[PDB]
Amino acid sequence: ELRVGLEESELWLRFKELTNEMIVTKNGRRMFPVLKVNVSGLDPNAMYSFLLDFVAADNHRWKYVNGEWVPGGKPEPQAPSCVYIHPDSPNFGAHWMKAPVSFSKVKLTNKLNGGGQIMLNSLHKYEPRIHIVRVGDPQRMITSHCFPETQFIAVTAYQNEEITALKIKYN
């Protein structure tokens, strides 16, 4: 069976219980924690690409009030659906399964200014999603996996001083 497991789930869960925040910038910012997954049940002989995108979690935006995240108004129009291609793609099942797959280089931005960055709306909640795409497949079979431990709000600056502190402690 295809299994895609979240690495450092217990680290993600520390951020998630505070409500996780990821910085977006003009030029794009790497994530902490980094999304890493373990994979089993691929065909080791087959070739696959690994894709990452971010799904909008809510029909509303959020704001940080009196140290709580609350519904913060109507959403902006959905950010363009940007997909990140893992730089190891395309590769053998064996490659993907022999070690955790790390999305260390993906950059989150609030400006479409090129370089394979992901555009997100500040104060909107997102859930990372990985797609496995089989190479050379006439059916173009794709599998998708969501990671609810990895949910965060996109921010131009940290709202929760506890998140700021956690990001320094564990990085």
Query: Which residues of the shown chain bind ligand O1A in the complex (CB under 6 A)?
Result: 8, 10-11, 14, 170
Output 10 or 17, the one with its CB closest to ligand O1A: 10
Shortest Å, Cβ 137 to ligand O1A: 35
Contact criterion met (CB below 8 Å) for 75 and 60: yes
Output 12 or 126, the one with its CB closest to ligand O1A: 12
Shortest Å, Cβ 6 to ligand O1A: 12
Nearest to 47 by CA among 130, 134, 140, 132: 134
Other C-beta atoms lying within 10 Å of the C-beta of residue 150: 23
Output 63 or 170, the one with its CB closest to ligand O1A: 170
**Three-state SS at 158:** coil
Output 47 or 106, the one with its CB closest to ligand O1A: 106
7: which DSSP letter?
T
Shortest Å, Cβ 162 to ligand O1A: 14
Shortest Å, Cβ 167 to ligand O1A: 12
User: How far is Cα of residue 113 from the mean position of the Cα atoms in its chain?
Assistant: 19
Nearest to 7 by CA among 40, 35, 30: 35
